[PDB]
């Protein structure tokens, strides 16, 4: 019955602005301190903001000080993280969480929170001046003639797309096992790129038609590619 | 001398020299005696008129400057001295004064330096001359001014609701003469609900705006935003008027009215169809309402003949206010602005509404007479007469020029009044004063206020009842606790005022005029729980506020050592039963019925001891004052035991013990037990009425619907016959008939 | 500024093991530390609060402890569902900081990566770029190092790689290495070699292709 829902995310251009909404239900919002904790891809948890339980004095990390603004509304029973002058570095998954007054202590020189009990699902925020774009698929077939005995390796290169996510399947899901789709990497240009590969018996190569199916929904793109 | 000695001399020389020029040439000698009778808003206008005909008298000009000095208006006082000095150079002491005042107020301008040089050559090396030389040096530099500004801003970041600090920001802006920024912050701050309630802030708001109107910067800049700032002045006047009437004395309140009326007259000429025009509309109503409240304040202290005539006059004022239509909300630029304007509208209709009623209950269609007799333009002059001194020009006074056309002379409808109150709960920041007033105003009416709806408008998403009821920790505060609290605050307040007048109407007092109606203890609690819930507490004071709330919880829940008189508990019990018995949903029904049973279960042991005429153990420093005025008597005991047994049965029914509920309901032939018996017999019928099922069972199912019909008919039969039974109905009569129509068509 | 230094960064263990993770506070900090479990992509969950107090609902095999300025998470008997990343968190005056995190990977025997190099496709050359792909498939452990040779010439600063998470069936990883530069520079060299070093490889192994085969 008690939950936190994050909203107000999505992509934005550098130097732009966004506003996240952390909607709370099940605990008295007045006596709870609200926090925001972001996490870039493959990185750790970074505390960015806090709101003392019963009054709402702000406190931010120096990485975002002066740019972000966290607020709490009793009437709407919701907290928000206003973000300004967003930089590419701010691209990250933003979580919110509460710490009851039972865990919120005020001391000489600042206040402390014992831990974060309730966390939200986490809303994604992407900051990149790159504009939306569909993927270009380049095949990766085996220049091997039964190299590894009875099994060979084929794959597809999904490149020059923005933003995350891309989804891949082989023979429309017929070839499920043996597949390994790797995470994407931010090319300096601004577009992401990944690879998808599968190990299949070389004896079946040339007999079973192998096709990778990529779908980039943010740009309404669909591409099937044989190898 | 007195007020009579000086205002009677008006007719003395008025009958000796009646032409306007000689009438105004006596203004200085009129003002000569008001300065002696401690009248400075009056003496100011008397001398100012003599200055309108005798503009070259150095004595009169100085006298006004000396009067503006008592008013502490430096800019105005200095200018007056200047005129007297430029007319007559021999006034050395005034050259010192000008130099003395210019250096104390602001040194940034070289004019203060110049006048100090002259003051030196008029008084060579006097003790004061050096004093002024040191004063002029005192003022800080550019880096120093910037230094102070940063402190206030950094201080306002974490303390935006501090009245004093925000005032200082306007004063710092005003010291650098960047008044546009002063009003800009003043405007953006009129959205703050707390500051709007601060008397001293609104006073600062009125000045900083007027200063900008006359300021050279206002004209040069543009005439587009001129209207925008002008709106805030009127709004500020309304808030300032509400506050001045309550705290300040008779004299100060009346004086504020004249500034309000001057503003209204100066605004009406522009007109148009934008926020300013809409604001003028709503503020127009406030003016009369407050003017009516102002009128009633004077009469209270005065004799009976003046009271009736003044209350008659006030009744017209409130009427004028109530008539004013709801302002055009859509017409405002922003969501915050329009919501504010509507909030004030509800406040106007609510306050004036209850007043209109309480004054009309005195006699039969008393309102009709008020309009038929004083709606005449003669009343407009009788109103201006009682409120103001006739000496002021009756042309530029809005009161004397308003077109009082077709006064509705229709008493207000309760249903409309309720939605006005509910919408205006946030008018005065939900001060327990505000609610305790409303709760008392409804104490005399036949329809009760939606308190549970008031609290929902204040503390949103505060649960009706907290799951963790075991402890008294104030994180478990519930709208029930508050609802239970306000009930006692009003039940307590009413009894206290009843005792007061007995030693010496209580309903008739308007909201500003009356003093604190609750104990400082109760007020402290409400202010605490409010600051806590709304998240406007202080990290340091959190623990203190939290405990302050915790202290009283055990009483609102009738736990260990509750300071609750048995009558107040019973009042809580029945007031919650009937409040809950009329609700539609089961969740709310269960909760309110539960609490009602709870309080009942705590009283009955007391009633049994009281039933045998014994003594109740009196409390230790109770939270809700005990009174022997409402001490329970044996004559009423058996009734409560019965009324309680109903509340038990109702909860039994809601929980599922229908067999015991019906067995109990049927035992007592009460109108309320019918509506319960009927409501539960109908449910057993409706569910089983149409599905395929044993025919014999179907006949038994129909049989229940037959009982429902009968009990509803018994309600209406007994209802139409007697009025006392109509008031006992747990739901409205028309609601009972509504079900019956559907019951029989089934 | 206070810092919570978490160690180890990456841990490898098997079921039933008694596992230990530790965080050091730079300055002397009071017992206001917490511990969290974050499974891939999901939200972080609270395991221990106030250093050694267990959060309601957490299994009893979790326990927190402190020694001087070093805080330690201890799992008495590791379970399959506990193979996730963990974080330590301190709350000092008006500030919260997290450790770098500790990933608990399932331990298994060593496996050698089956490598396959792939050239840039005709379609990509049409666009004007050239990406070479080097697969490292189903190996263990995560640690490995790949190097690129253009005509037996080292390359750095122009290629990137990414690794899959530990597979569910065999508990092995995979790596995709991409060497990206212009077609013009790709047509300037003939030989291309991808070398791999790994604990599972008896000796470093390399596979290569020549433009035009």
> CB B223: neighbour CB atoms within 10 A?
8
Q: How far from the centroid of its chain's Cα atoms is residue C26's Cα?
A: 25
Scanning the structure block, which residue is given the tokens 């770029």?
A: C129
Nearest alpha carbon to residue B510 among B239, B261, B295, B258: B295
Residue A125 bridge partners (DSSP): A10, A92
CB B341 within 8 A of CB B332: yes
A:B CB pairs within 8 Å: 51
Residues A96 and A194 in one domain: no
C-beta atoms of C98 and A119 within 8 A: no
3-class DSSP state for residue A92? strand
Query: CA-CA distance, B275 to B621, in Å (whole number)?
Result: 52
Question: How does DSSP assign A160-182, residue by residue?
Answer: EEBSS--EEEEGGGT--TTEEEP
Cis geometry, peptide bond prior to residue C8 (ω within 30 degrees of 0): yes
Residue C160 bridge partners (DSSP): C178
CA distances from A68 to A5, A81, B535 (A): 20, 7, 20
Interface of chain A toward chain B, CB-CB under 8 angstroms: 25, 28-31, 52-57, 72, 74-77, 100-101, 106, 111
C-beta atoms of C49 and A142 within 8 A: no
Last residue of a domain, one of A93, A127, A161: A127
CB-CB neighbors (< 8 A) of A142 in chain C: 116, 118
Question: How does DSSP assign B79-142, residue by residue?
Answer: HHHHHHHHH-TT-HHHHHHHHHHHHHH--SSHHHHHHHHHHHHHSTT-HHHHHHHHHHHHS--H
> CB B14: neighbour CB atoms within 10 A?
12
Residues A7 and A46 in one domain: yes
C-beta atoms of C121 and A157 within 8 A: yes
The CA radius of gyration of chain C, in Å to the nearest whole number, is 23
CA distances from B313 to A1, B298, B632 (A): 58, 12, 42
Cβ neighbours of residue B104 closer than 8 Å, sequence gap 6 or more? B74, B135
Query: CA-CA distance, B116 to B96, in Å (whole number)?
Result: 7
What is the chain B residue with the closest CA to A52? Answer: B539
Terminal alpha carbon distance of chain C: 58
C-beta atoms of B532 and A77 within 8 A: no
Residues A120 and A27 in one domain: yes
CB-CB neighbors (< 8 A) of A100 in chain B: 475
Range of the domain at A189: 136-226
Query: CA-CA distance, B537 to B528, in Å (whole number)?
Result: 8
Residues A190 and A100 in one domain: no
Scanning the structure block, which residue is given the tokens 């003639």?
A: A145
B462 and chain A in contact, CB less than 8 A = yes
Residue B517 CA neighbour count, 13 Å, CB half: 31
Last residue of a domain, one of C106, C137, C158: C106
Nearest alpha carbon to residue A37 among A26, A24, A51: A51
Query: CA-CA distance, B257 to B236, in Å (whole number)?
Result: 13
Cβ neighbours of residue B404 closer than 8 Å, sequence gap 6 or more? B320, B375, B377, B380
CB A91 within 8 A of CB A123: no
> CB A139: neighbour CB atoms within 10 A?
19
CA distances from B517 to B458, B506, B564 (A): 20, 11, 19
The CA radius of gyration of chain A, in Å to the nearest whole number, is 23
> CB A133: neighbour CB atoms within 10 A?
17
3-class DSSP state for residue A143? coil
B461 and chain A in contact, CB less than 8 A = yes
CB-CB neighbors (< 8 A) of A147 in chain C: 116
CB C67 within 8 A of CB C113: no
CB C100 within 8 A of CB C185: no
CB C154 within 8 A of CB C193: no
A46, A52, A114: best to mutate for the C interface, most C CBs within 10 A: A114
Cβ neighbours of residue B533 closer than 8 Å, sequence gap 6 or more? A30, A74, B459, B462, B477
Residue B227, token pair as written in the block: 């209207």
Cβ neighbours of residue A111 closer than 8 Å, sequence gap 6 or more? A52, A57, A104, A105, B539, C93, C94
Q: After which residues is chain B broken (C to N over 2.5 A)?
A: 504
Q: What does chain B come to in residues?
A: 746
Last residue of a domain, one of A106, A127, A148: A127
Dihedral angle computed from the Cα positions of residues A159, A161, A165 and A166, in that order, rounded to the nearest 10 degrees: -50
Residues A95 and A187 in one domain: no
Cβ neighbours of residue B91 closer than 8 Å, sequence gap 6 or more? B58, B62, B84, B85
Cβ neighbours of residue A105 closer than 8 Å, sequence gap 6 or more? A111, A112, A113, A114, C32
| Helices and strands in chain A: count of H runs, count of E runs | 0, 21
Cβ neighbours of residue B493 closer than 8 Å, sequence gap 6 or more? B436, B439, B440, B517, B518
Query: CA-CA distance, B173 to B179, in Å (whole number)?
Result: 6
Q: How far from the centroid of its chain's Cα atoms is residue B117's Cα?
A: 53
Please name the residues between 92 and 151 in chain C that touch chain A, using a CB distance below 8 Å.
92-101, 114, 116-121, 123-124, 127, 131, 133, 135, 137-138
Q: Does the CA dihedral A171-A176-A179-A182 come out positive or negative? A: positive
Question: How does DSSP assign B372-414, residue by residue?
Answer: HHHSSHHHHHHHHHHHS-TTS-SSS-HHHH---------PPPH
B532 and chain A in contact, CB less than 8 A = yes
The H or E element containing residue A211 is strand A211-216
Residue C174, token pair as written in the block: 């995979």
Nearest alpha carbon to residue B411 among B361, B357, B373: B357
What is the chain A residue with the closest CA to C93? Answer: A110
CB-CB neighbors (< 8 A) of B461 in chain A: 25, 29, 77
A:C CB pairs within 8 Å: 143
Query: CA-CA distance, A86 to A38, in Å (whole number)?
Result: 13
Cis geometry, peptide bond prior to residue B495 (ω within 30 degrees of 0): no
> Secondary structure of B307-360 in the HEC alphabet?
HHHHHHHHHHHHHHHHHCCCCCCCCCCCHHHHHHHHHHHHHHHHHHHHHHHHHH
The H or E element containing residue A94 is strand A92-100
CA distances from B84 to B41, B50, B76, B301 (A): 21, 14, 13, 43
Query: CA-CA distance, C6 to C103, in Å (whole number)?
Result: 11
Question: How does DSSP assign B503-547, residue by residue?
Answer: H--TTTS-TTTS---S-HHHHHHHHHHHHHHTT---TTTHHHHHH
C-beta atoms of A55 and B538 within 8 A: yes
The CA radius of gyration of chain B, in Å to the nearest whole number, is 33
Residues A145 and A104 in one domain: no
Residues A172 and A212 in one domain: yes
C18 phi and psi angles, rounded to 5 deg: -90, 105
Last residue of a domain, one of C106, C128, C143: C106
Residue A186 bridge partners (DSSP): A192
Query: CA-CA distance, A113 to A132, in Å (whole number)?
Result: 40
Question: Nearest CA of chain C to the CA of A15: how many Å?
Answer: 26
Residues A151 and A222 in one domain: yes
Residue B539, token pair as written in the block: 């990290």
Phi-psi region of C44 (alpha: psi -120 to 50; beta: other; left: phi over 0): beta
Residues C28 and C82 in one domain: yes
C91, C138, C166: best to mutate for the A interface, most A CBs within 10 A: C91
Query: CA-CA distance, B226 to B211, in Å (whole number)?
Result: 13
Residues C89 and C14 in one domain: yes
Contacts by residues B320-323 (CB-CB < 8 Å, ≥ 24 positions apart): B320/B285, B320/B288, B320/B404, B320/B407, B321/B285, B321/B286, B321/B287, B321/B288, B321/B289, B321/B292, B321/B348, B321/B352, B322/B285, B322/B348, B322/B349, B322/B352, B322/B353, B322/B356, B322/B408, B322/B412, B323/B407, B323/B408
Residue C153, token pair as written in the block: 């010439």
Residue B254, token pair as written in the block: 């009346």
CB B324 within 8 A of CB B281: yes
Residues C38 and C73 in one domain: yes
Tally of domains within chain A: 2
Scanning the structure block, which residue is given the tokens 């200085």?
A: B28
Contacts by residues B426-430 (CB-CB < 8 Å, ≥ 24 positions apart): B426/B193, B426/B343, B426/B457, B426/B458, B427/B343, B427/B344, B427/B346, B427/B347, B427/B350, B428/B197, B428/B242, B428/B347, B429/B193, B429/B194, B429/B197, B430/B458, B430/B530
CB-CB neighbors (< 8 A) of B539 in chain A: 52, 54-55, 57, 106, 111
Query: CA-CA distance, C150 to C208, in Å (whole number)?
Result: 10
Phi-psi region of B281 (alpha: psi -120 to 50; beta: other; left: phi over 0): alpha
CA distances from C157 to B269, B418, B563, C121 (A): 75, 74, 79, 22
Exposure string for C25-50, b = 16+ CB within 10 A, e = fewer: beeebeebbbbbbbeeeebbbbbbbb
* Continuous H helices in B560-670: 566-581, 586-611, 634-655, 658-667
Please name the residues between 66 and 85 in chain A that touch chain C, using a CB distance below 8 Å.
none
Burial class (CB in 10 A: 0-12, 13-18, 19+), C21: buried
Residue B168, token pair as written in the block: 């200082």
CA distances from B319 to B277, B359, B410 (A): 21, 11, 9
Cβ neighbours of residue A85 closer than 8 Å, sequence gap 6 or more? A15, A17, A67
Residue C116 bridge partners (DSSP): C135
3-class DSSP state for residue B496? helix
CB A24 within 8 A of CB A98: yes
Terminal alpha carbon distance of chain B: 84
Angle, vertex CA B700, rays to CA B695 and CA B704, nearest 5: 140
C-beta atoms of C87 and A44 within 8 A: yes
Residue A6 bridge partners (DSSP): A22
Q: What does chain A come to in residues?
A: 227
Residues A36 and A110 in one domain: yes
Task: Return the CATH number at C44.
Answer: 2.60.40.10
Query: CA-CA distance, B36 to B6, in Å (whole number)?
Result: 10
> CB B200: neighbour CB atoms within 10 A?
13
Last residue of a domain, one of A69, A92, A127: A127
Contacts by residues A201-206 (CB-CB < 8 Å, ≥ 24 positions apart): A201/A150, A201/A151, A201/A152, A202/A142, A202/A144, A202/A145, A202/A146, A202/A147, A202/A148, A202/A149, A202/A150, A202/A151, A202/A152, A203/A146, A203/A150, A205/A142, A205/A152
Strands (E), B396-484: none
| Helices and strands in chain B: count of H runs, count of E runs | 37, 0
Residues C66 and C128 in one domain: no
Residues A41 and A73 in one domain: yes
CA distances from B306 to B4, B292, B297, B378, C131 (A): 17, 14, 11, 17, 100
Describe the strand order of the beta sheet including C205-210 as a list of residue ranges.
Answer: C154-155, C145-150, C191-197, C205-210
3-class DSSP state for residue A96? strand
> Secondary structure of B607-637 in the HEC alphabet?
HHHHHCCCCCCCCCCCCCCCCHHHCCCHHHH
Question: How does DSSP assign chain C, residue by residue?
Answer: ---EEEE-SEEEE-TT--EEEEEEESS---S-EEEEEE-TTS--EEEEETTTEEPTTS-TTEEEEEETTEEEEEESS--GGG-SEEEEEEEETTEEEE---EEEEEP---B--EEEEEPPPHHHHHHTEEEEEEEEEEEBSS--EEEEEESS-EE-SSEEEEEPPPPSSS--EEEEEEEEEEHHHHTT--EEEEEEE-TTSSS-EEEEEETT-
Residues C89 and C125 in one domain: no
C31 phi and psi angles, rounded to 5 deg: -80, 75
C96, C125, C128: best to mutate for the A interface, most A CBs within 10 A: C96
In this structure, are strands A123-127 and A10-12 parallel, antiparallel, or unpaired? parallel
Exposure string for B620-629, b = 16+ CB within 10 A, e = fewer: eebbbbbbee
Task: Return the CATH number at A117.
Answer: 2.60.40.10
Scanning the structure block, which residue is given the tokens 């920041």?
A: B429
> CB A169: neighbour CB atoms within 10 A?
18
Residues A169 and A205 in one domain: yes
Q: Does the CA dihedral B283-B289-B293-B299 come out positive or negative? A: positive
CB-CB neighbors (< 8 A) of A55 in chain B: 535-539, 542
Residues C9 and C94 in one domain: yes
Last residue of a domain, one of C106, C137, C154: C106
C-beta atoms of A103 and C118 within 8 A: no
Q: Which of the 8 DSSP states describes residue B9?
A: H
Scanning the structure block, which residue is given the tokens 């957490």?
A: C58
Cβ neighbours of residue B429 closer than 8 Å, sequence gap 6 or more? B193, B194, B197
CB-CB neighbors (< 8 A) of B532 in chain A: 30-31, 54
Question: Nearest CA of chain A to the CA of B527: how many Å?
Answer: 14
CB B341 within 8 A of CB B378: no
Range of the domain at C10: 4-106
Residues A7 and A116 in one domain: yes
C43 and chain A in contact, CB less than 8 A = yes
C-beta atoms of A75 and B460 within 8 A: yes
Residue B290, token pair as written in the block: 């407050």
C-beta atoms of C118 and A141 within 8 A: yes
Terminal alpha carbon distance of chain A: 50
3-class DSSP state for residue B13? helix
Architecture of domain B3-143: Alpha Horseshoe (1.25)
B160, B529, B542: best to mutate for the A interface, most A CBs within 10 A: B542
Cis geometry, peptide bond prior to residue A163 (ω within 30 degrees of 0): yes
CB C50 within 8 A of CB C32: yes
Query: CA-CA distance, B196 to B344, in Å (whole number)?
Result: 12
A32 phi and psi angles, rounded to 5 deg: -105, 140
Angle, vertex CA B63, rays to CA B57 and CA B69, nearest 5: 140
Q: What is the resolution of this structure in A?
A: 4.0
């Amino acid at each position: 019955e008690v939950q936190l829902v994050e909203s107000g995310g999505g992509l934005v251009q550098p130097g732009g602005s966004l506003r996240l909404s952390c909607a709370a239900s099940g605990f008295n919002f007045s006596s709870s301190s609200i926090h925001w904790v972001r996490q870039a891809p493959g990185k750790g948890l970074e505390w960015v903001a806090s709101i003392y339980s019963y009054s709402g004095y702000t406190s931010y990390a120096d990485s975002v000080k002066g740019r972000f603004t966290i607020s709490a509304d009793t009437s709407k029973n919701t907290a928000y993280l206003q973000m300004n002058s967003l930089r590419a570095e701010d691209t990250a998954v933003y979580y919110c969480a509460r710490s009851p007054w039972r865990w919120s202590g005020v001391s000489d020189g600042g206040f402390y929170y014992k831990a974060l009990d309730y966390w939200g699902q986490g809303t994604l925020v992407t900051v990149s001046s790159a504009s939306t774009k569909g993927p270009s698929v380049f095949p990766l077939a085996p220049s091997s003639k039964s190299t590894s005995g009875g099994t060979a390796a084929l794959g597809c290169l999904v490149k020059d797309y923005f933003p995350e996510p891309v989804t891949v399947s082989w023979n429309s899901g017929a070839l499920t096992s043996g597949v390994h789709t790797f995470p994407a990497v931010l090319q300096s240009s601004g577009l992401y790129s990944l690879s998808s590969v599968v190990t299949v018996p070389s004896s079946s190569l040339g007999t079973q038609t192998y096709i990778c199916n990529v779908n980039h929904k943010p740009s309404n793109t669909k591409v099937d590619k044989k190898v | 001398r007195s007020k009579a000695d000086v205002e009677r001399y008006i007719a003395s020389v008025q009958g000796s020299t009646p032409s306007p020029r000689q009438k105004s040439m006596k203004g200085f000698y009129f003002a000569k005696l008001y300065y002696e009778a401690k009248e400075y808003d009056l003496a100011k206008k008397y001398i100012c008129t003599y200055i309108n005909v005798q503009e070259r008298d150095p004595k009169a000009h100085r006298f006004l400057g000396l009067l503006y000095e008592l008013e502490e208006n430096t800019d105005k006082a200095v200018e007056c001295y200047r005129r007297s000095v430029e007319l007559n150079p021999t006034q050395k002491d005034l050259v010192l004064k000008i130099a003395e005042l210019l250096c104390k107020n602001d040194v940034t301008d070289g004019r203060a330096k110049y006048w100090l040089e002259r003051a030196a050559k008029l008084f060579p090396g006097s003790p004061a001359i050096y004093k002024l030389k040191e004063q002029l040096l005192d003022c800080e530099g550019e880096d120093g001014w910037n230094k102070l500004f940063d402190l206030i801003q950094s201080e306002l970041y974490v303390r935006p609701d501090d009245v004093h600090v925000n005032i200082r920001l306007v004063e710092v802006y005003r010291s650098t003469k960047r008044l546009k920024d002063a009003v800009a912050h003043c405007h953006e701050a009129e959205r703050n609900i707390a500051l709007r309630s601060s008397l001293e802030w609104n006073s600062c708001v009125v000045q900083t705006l007027k200063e900008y109107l006359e300021s050279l910067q206002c004209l040069e800049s543009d005439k587009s935003d001129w209207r925008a700032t002008n709106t805030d002045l009127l709004l500020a006047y309304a808030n300032l008027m509400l506050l001045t009437l309550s705290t300040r004395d008779v004299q100060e309140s009346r004086e504020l009215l004249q500034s309000f009326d001057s503003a209204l007259q100066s605004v009406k000429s522009l007109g148009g169809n934008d926020e300013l025009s809409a604001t003028f509309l709503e503020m127009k109503g406030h003016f009369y309402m407050h003017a009516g409240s102002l009128l009633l304040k004077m009469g209270q202290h005065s004799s009976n003949v003046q009271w009736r005539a003044l209350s008659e006059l006030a009744a017209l004022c409130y009427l004028i206010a109530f008539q004013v239509p709801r302002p055009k909300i859509k017409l405002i630029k922003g969501e915050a602005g329009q919501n504010l304007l509507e909030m004030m509208a509800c406040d106007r209709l609510s306050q004036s509404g209850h007043m209109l009623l309480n004054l009309s209950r005195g006699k039969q269609d008393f309102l009709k007479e008020i309009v038929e007799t004083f709606a005449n333009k003669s009343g407009q002059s009788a109103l201006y007469d009682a409120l103001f001194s006739s000496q002021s020009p009756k042309d530029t006074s809005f009161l004397g020029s308003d077109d009082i056309g077709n006064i509705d002379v229709r008493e207000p409808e309760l249903e409309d009044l309720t939605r006005y109150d509910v919408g205006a709960i946030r008018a005065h920041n939900g001060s327990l004063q505000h609610l305790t007033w409303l709760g008392l105003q409804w104490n005399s009416l036949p329809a009760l206020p939606g308190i549970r709806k008031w609290l929902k408008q204040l503390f949103h998403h505060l649960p009706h009842e907290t799951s963790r009821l075991e402890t008294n920790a104030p994180e478990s505060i519930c709208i029930l606790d508050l609802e239970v609290f306000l009930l006692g605050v009003v039940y307590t307040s009413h009894l206290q005022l009843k005792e007061k007048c007995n030693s010496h109407q209580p309903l008739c007092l308007p909201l500003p005029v009356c003093k604190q109606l609750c104990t400082e203890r109760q007020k402290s609690w409400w202010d605490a729980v409010c600051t806590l819930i709304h998240r406007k507490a202080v990290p340091g004071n959190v623990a203190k506020l939290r405990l302050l709330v915790q202290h009283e919880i055990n009483t609102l829940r009738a736990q260990e050592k509750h300071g609750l008189q048995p009558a107040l508990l019973v009042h809580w019990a029945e007031c919650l039963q009937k409040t809950g018995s009329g609700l539609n949903s089961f969740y709310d029904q269960r909760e309110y019925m539960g609490r009602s049973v709870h309080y009942w279960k705590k009283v009955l042991p007391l009633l049994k001891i009281i039933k045998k005429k014994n003594s109740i153990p009196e409390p230790i420093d109770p939270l809700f004052k005990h009174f022997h005025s409402v001490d329970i008597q044996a004559s009423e005991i058996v009734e409560y035991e019965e009324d309680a047994h109903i509340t038990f049965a109702i909860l039994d029914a809601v929980n599922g013990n229908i067999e015991d509920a019906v067995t109990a309901f049927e035992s007592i032939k009460s109108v309320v037990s019918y509506w319960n018996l009927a409501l539960i017999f109908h449910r057993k019928a409706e569910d089983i009425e149409n599905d395929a099922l044993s025919p014999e069972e179907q006949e038994e199912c129909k049989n229940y619907l037959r009982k429902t019909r009968d009990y509803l008919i018994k309600i209406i039969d007994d209802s139409d016959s007697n009025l006392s039974v109509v008031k006992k109905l747990p739901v409205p009569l028309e609601s009972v008939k509504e079900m019956l129509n559907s019951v029989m068509q089934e | 500024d206070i810092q919570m230094t978490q160690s180890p960064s990456s841990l490898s263990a098997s079921v039933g093991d008694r596992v230990t993770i530790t965080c050091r506070a730079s300055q002397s900090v009071s017992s206001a530390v917490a511990w969290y479990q974050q499974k891939p992509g999901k939200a972080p969950k609270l395991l221990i609060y106030s250093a050694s107090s267990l959060y309601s609902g957490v299994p009893s095999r979790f326990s927190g402890s402190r020694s001087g300025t070093d805080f330690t998470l201890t799992i008495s008997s590791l379970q399959p569902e506990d193979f996730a990343t963990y974080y330590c968190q301190q709350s000092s005056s008006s500030l919260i900081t997290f450790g770098q995190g500790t990933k608990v990977e399932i331990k298994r025997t060593v496996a050698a990566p089956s490598v396959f190099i792939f050239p840039p496709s005709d379609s990509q050359l049409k666009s004007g770029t050239a990406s070479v792909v080097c697969l490292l498939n189903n190996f263990y452990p995560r640690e490995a190092k790949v190097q690129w040779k253009v005509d037996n010439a080292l390359q750095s600063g122009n290629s990137q790689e990414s690794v899959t998470e530990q597979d569910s069936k065999d508990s092995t990883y995979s790596l995709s290495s991409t060497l990206t530069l212009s077609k013009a520079d790709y047509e300037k060299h003939k030989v291309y070699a991808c070398e791999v070093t790994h604990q599972g490889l008896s000796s470093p192994v390399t596979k290569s292709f020549n433009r035009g085969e």
